[PDB]
């Protein structure tokens, strides 16, 4: 789709966002037959996801060679709570059934959102406008089972309700049960309100029990020139392993405005966050109270063939104090349908609980800091939409353990040089969506490649319909990756060879109300790991259906 909200919080055409952007819709997710968020993200440019096995197991997201803690994940605009204790986003627990849209914008965005937005930003949206009720379910390899009931209806004029329940289970397993309710209200044709509440109960296998609930409420104004939003959020998670218990409550309040001025816009906002942990959470002795407040400004202008886009933010954190970030981009459409874009931006990552207050803690840590430069050419040629970008990311003040003193300090440096190339085009009835990433991510002090990241990836999606059958084939090449073997000491660095992977999916409208679908994932039964030592699934079959009325 064309409109995004994730670049500056407010709706704008993608063509006007100078950073590389990707949008995934629910229609996309339904066709691909993804059974996890990771399976969605894995398909997209610059994404390198590793996982300790199959569904539900611990996983890491490396966007454009950056550390796992250097991606900002938002759910409906607000920092994912599950990232809260460890200070690093893991989506393996977040229910796929709740995903209605993903908006993913690469490059820095601390200047809008604050901490973590270094490699990029991933915004998982849970809202839909899609009247009706749906029942669906599926069955697959490894005793995979799913069923789900969902309904959105009008409760008179101005108010609409959404209700969802979902059960997902797999064995070696992982069991996830989810409930979601939302109420939306139009006071007028410009003033809106919403209240949202959801929660899930996950069990994974040593056993993990994870409870998470989130409540959001807000008010929005959508006028001809002026747009505003006041947004409230509360998330509570309890993560049991066995025993340890990690428990965090996260409080968010944000107020943002934006106005259309000429061929462009200007915006500002204030963003407050409180996180509270329980004693013994995150292997820290005491319970902690962390607070952050940020203020920022955005801008977009089009003059002639040129486009200018920018943001700047000041954050005040209860532990490290004040840190400012900014970014600026310019695009030149030098000939119709072609653009050169140049970008610069700074971003940062806040120290986490363990690093500050754990056994090896240092309460005076400063943030990790990033500087990025990016240049791109984008075009439309002979029916092909394409883009190629080169970026450099210098990361400094990395928080590292010193074995000399058994404490964490700011000191490491990394340098990432990367290339992203993308294209989409049709050939008769066939649709092609392709990307290539080169990622040269290095310790800038030793000049050694960083571990766990593939230097090269190729991803290819091929879609077409013939009789009434909707077919999709997905191809991925995962390049070579260096990792450590933790089965025994000492921990040896190993070299995992590149692998090719293929998936095949089909759908068919049995009626206008009933759609049946099947999928064979890892069609050639390739044996491979994304984390050394941890076996992935192998060839799996899934058969599913959805009935709408
Ligand atoms: C009235 C200010 C609104 C935009 C401020 C955020 C921009 C932060 O850096 C921009 C300054 O750096 C050079 C700006 O050059 C072009 C300005 O960007 C145009 C935004 O409308
Ligand atoms: C590297 C030095 C830092 C320079 C800071 C520059 C501050 C930005 O000032 C330029 C602002 O220009 C336009 C501001 O935003 C206007 C948005 O819409 C304007 C309508 O035409
Ligand atoms: C609203 C747009 C904001 C753009 C401003 C970004 C410009 C960055 O300013 C320069 C960076 O900060 C200067 C650091 O000062 C050097 C430290 O030396 C002090 C020694 O005590
Ligand atoms: C509407 C508020 C807009 C705030 C944007 C400024 C915050 C981002 O600033 C950029 C940070 O880069 C330099 C600022 O940090 C240096 C602090 O210097 C203060 C004393 O000289
Ligand atoms: C790195 C970006 C490269 C930009 C290359 C574009 C330079 C010229 O592009 C094509 C200009 O128009 C030519 C299109 O082909 C002829 C179509 O003529 C119109 C049909 O009557
Ligand atoms: C504007 C797109 C960048 C072009 C992609 C590959 C073209 C290579 O030109 C020379 C190769 O550059 C050597 C290093 O390439 C990786 C660096 O990426 C840019 C980071 O500085
Ligand atoms: C891509 C280099 C020449 C100009 C780009 C044309 C359109 C690019 O779409 C390519 C999508 O397919 C992947 C291309 O992979 C080769 C580019 O890799 C650059 C090597 O550093
Ligand atoms: Mg020494």
Contact (CB, 8 A) for 142 and 170: yes
Residue 483, number of CB atoms within 10 A of its CB: 20
Tokens 């950056």 appear where? 66
Instruction: Give the nearest ligand 5 atom to 338 CA.
Output: 4
Question: How far is ligand 1, taken at its centre, from the CA of residue 434, in Å?
Answer: 33
Tokens of 178: 């989810």
- The β-bridge relationship of strands 101-106 and 499-509 is unpaired
Asked if 302 and 264 count as a contact pair (C-beta separation under 8 A), the reply is yes
Phi, psi (rounded to 5 degrees) for 209 = -120, 120
CA dist list (Å): 216 to 8, 85, 252, 277, 286: 20, 20, 9, 20, 28
Instruction: Compute, in angstroms, the gap from residue 328 CA to the centroid of ligand 1.
Output: 7
Closest C-alpha to ligand 7, atom 4: 388
Distances (CA, A) of 102 to 108, 126, 330: 18, 9, 25
Pocket-testing residue among 266, 298, 302, ligand 2, by greatest number of atoms within 8 A of Cβ: 266
Task: Go through 169-179 and write b for each residue having 16 or more CB atoms within 10 A of its CB, e for each that does not.
Answer: bbeeebbbbbb
The label of the residue with tokens 């293929």 reads: 502
Please say whether the beta carbons of 183 and 195 come within 8 A.
yes
- Look at the chain and count its residues: 549
Extents of the domains making up the chain:
2-125, 126-549
CA 300 / ligand 1 centre spacing (Å): 8
DSSP 446-467: TTEEPSS--SEEEEEEEEEESS
Closest residue to atom 3 of ligand 2, CA basis: 326
How many angstroms does the Cα of residue 335 sit away from the middle of ligand 5? 8
First-to-final CA distance of the chain? 25
* Interatomic CA distance for residues 156 and 185, integer angstroms: 10
The position carrying tokens 């409208």 is: 509
Which of the ligands is closest to the CA of residue 459? 7
Q: What is the DSSP string of 134-171?
A: EEEEEEETTTEEEEEEEEEEE-SSSEEEEEEEEEEEE-
Q: Which amino acid residue places its CA nearest to atom 11 of ligand 2?
A: 299
Instruction: Read off the tokens for 111.
Output: 């200047």
Q: How far apart are CA 148 and CA 136, in angstroms?
A: 5
Tell me 68's DSSP state. G
Residue 377: CB within 6 Å of ligand 5? yes
548 phi/psi in degrees, rounded to 5: -115, 135
Residue nearest to atom 7 of ligand 1 (CA): 310
Does the beta carbon of 412 lie inside 6 Å of ligand 6?
no
Q: Which residue's alpha carbon is nearest to atom 14 within ligand 7? A: 421
Give the span between the Cα atoms of 315 and 318, in whole angstroms. 10
Does 421 contact ligand 6 (Cβ within 6 A)?
A: no
Closest CA to 220 of 271, 254, 181, 250: 254
Q: Which atom of ligand 6 is nearest to the CA of 376?
A: 1
Give me ligand 2 centre to Cα 79, in Å: 28
Distance in Å, CA 4 to ligand 2 centroid: 23
Distance 421 CA to ligand 7 centre (A): 5
CB atoms within 10 A of CB 287: 13
CATH fold, domain 2-125, is: Ferric Hydroxamate Uptake Protein; Chain A, domain 1 (2.170.130)
CB-side exposure of 239: number of CA atoms within 13 Å?
18
In whole angstroms, give the CA distance from residue 214 to residue 401.
34
- Preceding peptide of 490 cis, ω within 30°: yes
Nearest CA to ligand 6 atom 19: 390
Closest CA to 457 of 54, 20, 44: 44
- Peptide-bond breaks in the chain following residues (C–N over 2.5 A): 172, 205, 242
Provide CB contacts within 8 A for 461, sequence distance 6+.
43, 431, 432, 433, 434, 472, 473, 474, 475
Place of tokens 């944000």: 254
Instruction: Give the integer Cα–Cα distance in Å for 146 and 200.
Output: 15
Three-class SS state of 349: strand
Pairing of strands 289-303, 306-317: antiparallel
326 lines ligand 3 (CB under 6 A): yes
What's the reported resolution, in angstroms, to a tenth? 2.0
Q: Retrieve residue 68's tokens.
A: 């796992």
What does the alpha-carbon distance between residue 79 and residue 124 come to, in Å, rounded to a whole number?
10
CATH fold for the domain made of 126-549: Maltoporin; Chain A (2.40.170)
- Residue pair 176/202 in contact (Cβ under 8 Å)? The answer is yes
Alpha helices in 180-311 (DSSP H): none
Location of structure tokens 């450099």: 392
Check if the beta carbon of residue 217 is closer than 8 Å to that of residue 230.
no
């Amino acid at each position: 789709d064309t409109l995004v909200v994730t670049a500056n919080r407010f709706e704008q055409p993608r063509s006007t966002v100078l950073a590389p952007t990707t949008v995934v819709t629910r229609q996309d997710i339904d066709r691909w037959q993804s059974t996890s968020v990771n399976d969605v993200l894995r398909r997209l440019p610059g994404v390198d996801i590793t996982q300790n096995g199959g569904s539900g197991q611990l996983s890491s997201i490396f966007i454009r060679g950056t550390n796992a803690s250097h991606v900002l994940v938002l759910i409906d605009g607000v920092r994912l709570n599950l990232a809260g204790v460890s200070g690093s986003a893991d989506l393996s627990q977040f229910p796929i059934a709740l995903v209605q849209r993903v908006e993913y914008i690469r490059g820095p965005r601390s200047a809008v959102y604050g901490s973590d937005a270094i490699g990029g930003v991933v915004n998982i949206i849970t809202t839909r406008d899609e009247p009706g009720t749906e029942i669906s379910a599926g069955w697959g390899s490894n005793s995979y089972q799913n069923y789900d009931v969902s309904t959105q209806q009008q409760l008179g004029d101005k108010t609409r309700v959404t209700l969802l329940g979902d059960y997902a289970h797999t064995h070696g397993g992982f069991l996830s049960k989810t409930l979601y309710g939302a109420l939306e209200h139009n006071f007028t044709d410009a003033w809106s309100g919403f209240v949202r509440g959801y929660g899930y109960d996950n069990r994974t296998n040593d056993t993990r029990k994870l409870y998470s609930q989130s409540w959001d409420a807000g008010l929005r104004y959508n006028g001809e020139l002026i747009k505003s939003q006041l947004i409230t959020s509360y998330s509570h998670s309890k993560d049991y392993n066995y025993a340890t218990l990690d428990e965090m409550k996260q409080y968010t309040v944000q107020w943002a405005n934006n106005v259309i001025v000429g061929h462009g816009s200007i915006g500002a906002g204030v963003d407050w966050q409180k996180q509270t942990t329980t004693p013994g959470t995150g292997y820290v002795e005491d319970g902690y109270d962390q607070r952050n407040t940020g203020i920022y400004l955005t801008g977009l202008q089009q003059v002639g063939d040129f486009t200018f886009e920018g943001a700047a933010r000041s954050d005040d954190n209860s532990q490290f104090g004040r840190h400012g970030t900014w970014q600026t981009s310019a695009g030149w459409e030098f000939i119709e349908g072609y653009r050169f874009i140049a970008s610069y931006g700074t971003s940062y990552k806040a120290p986490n609980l363990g690093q500050l207050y754990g056994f090896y803690g240092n309460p005076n840590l400063d943030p990790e800091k990033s500087k990025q430069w990016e240049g791109a050419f984008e075009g439309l040629t002979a029916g092909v939409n394409w883009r190629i970008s080169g970026y450099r990311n210098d990361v400094s003040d990395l928080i590292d353990y010193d074995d000399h003193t058994l404490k964490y300090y700011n000191e490491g440096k990394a340098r990432i040089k990367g290339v992203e190339a993308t294209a989409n085009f049709d050939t008769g009835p066939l649709t092609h969506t392709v990307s290539y990433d080169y990622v040269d991510a290095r310790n800038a002090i030793t000049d050694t490649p960083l571990l766990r990241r593939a230097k090269q990836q190729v991803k290819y999606q091929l879609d077409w319909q013939l009789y009434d059958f909707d077919w999709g084939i997905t191809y991925q090449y995962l390049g070579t990756r260096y990792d450590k073997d933790y089965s025994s000491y000492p921990y040896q660095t190993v070299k995992m060879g590149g692998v090719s992977l293929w998936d095949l999916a089909v759908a068919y409208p049995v009626t206008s109300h009933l759609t049946v679908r099947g999928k064979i994932a890892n069609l050639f039964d390739k044996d491979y790991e994304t984390v050394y030592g941890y076996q992935t699934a192998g060839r799996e079959y899934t058969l599913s259906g959805s009935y709408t009325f």
